[PDB]
Amino acid sequence: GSSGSSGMASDEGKLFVGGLSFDTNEQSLEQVFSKYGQISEVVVVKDRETQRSRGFGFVTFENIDDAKDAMMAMNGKSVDGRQIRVDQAGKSSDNRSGPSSG
């Protein structure tokens, strides 16, 4: 097929990584994404029964450019001899509030 406008440019900060090796943990990822740029936090989705690892995760970056900066690097990279991919994940979070005065 042939696409016209090749460019989303709608990064929010979170990245969508898939095909992560079981070994790949919240730390490993960071250790890598850290060499590319700054990181805010990591999130490795897991099952509810075995609670091991679904097979994908997401690393939150301070700002937008911060993430996209690393995406252009990981996007189609090999972490420890793998073939995972990286691209704009999107925006997914739940509201939350906390006390101030006590």
Query: What are the residue boundaries of the structural domains of the chain, listed by start?
Result: 10-102
Q: Which technique?
A: NMR
- What CATH number should be reported for the domain whose range is 10-102? 3.30.70.330
Smallest Cα–Cα separation from 57: which of 87, 17, 24, 90? 17
Contact 26, 44 (CB under 8 A): yes
Instruction: State how far the Cα of 46 lies from the Cα of 64, in Å rounded to an integer.
Output: 25
